[PDB]
Amino acid sequence: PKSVKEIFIEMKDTVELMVDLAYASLLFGDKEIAEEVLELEERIDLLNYQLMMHSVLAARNVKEAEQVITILQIANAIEDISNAAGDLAKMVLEGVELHPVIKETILEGEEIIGKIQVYPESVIVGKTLGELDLATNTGVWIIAVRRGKRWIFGPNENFKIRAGDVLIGRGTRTSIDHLKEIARGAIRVI
Template sequence: MVRVEKIEYKPVGARELLIEMKDLSELMIDLAYSATLFNSPELAQEVIEMESHIDTLTYLLSMNVMVAARDGDDAESLVGVTKVARATDKISDAAADMATIVLQGIGIHPVIREAFEKVEERLTRVEVKPESILTEKQLGELGLAAKMGVDVIAIRRNKRWIIDPEENETLQKGDVLIVRGAPQGVEEIEGVAKGTIQKLED
């Protein structure tokens, strides 16, 4: 992979970096299987972007660990951190491999679909359009779980992912939402995010 963006050192807590890497890698596995199942290039594309983001986090973590290690004892006790990070990176690479199958348009054999069909819930990716009633609303006041049976499991805002967003998170236009739910609810939320549905039914 050609990397055009130089990753600059900045001091970030290893703790924060590891939490983000763990959450992202778990989400990626979920998205990657779903992308394969539903033959969804949109979900696959999110996985690829997350993979590149995890690469960045891995570099940042390595640099911060180096700066933190003052002597041999530090180094010994920090080497475990880099190993966990490397394993997380490998998990995310594997998820990206799976997503690539979809993006390369390799036909997914019926056998694969069947294997995943017992998954009753669907996963989708929707972008919040300016004209959507979701814009500038808090997740809690929207009550999507009660009204449509869907759950926003992640939000991508520019280059940042918010995993398991809180009730008081305010949605903004341009947000990309990863939503899980029953097939009907998933269809509804797609209309709501696009703005073609302008009212939430109770």
């Protein structure tokens, strides 16, 4: 038996990832990332359905119905951000020629998206994301990892980095360049 909070947290955590990937796919014109986004859009509809199922069954009296509505209302805004993400994804899958200012805009905002190469020498090779907490210890958020021909989306704390992995992360420009050097093996301390 899942809780409303459980379901709700995954919705928020998933849509945050979806918006990040929609931008990743636009920047790299990557159709596989774009397709991950639409799969996630489905999971959101499924989570929202379940949130409604729990919510509806839970209101006993008037005051509680009133509250259960504030939840649906928020899940609705999350729902709208999810479809918006899907929209950006479709543009990539459609294969339309993107105006150059789009990729530059994603690389020059307060928070950009960056691609990081991991070298054999890097002090992070062998460390899990959990152990590392780059989000925590570097402000760079790892949203995906291209390990050869495969993609690991929304990797967890168990995921262990290998030389050759290409980290896809979000953070400030400075956060990303820094992290890149830690990955070339230029910076031996994290």
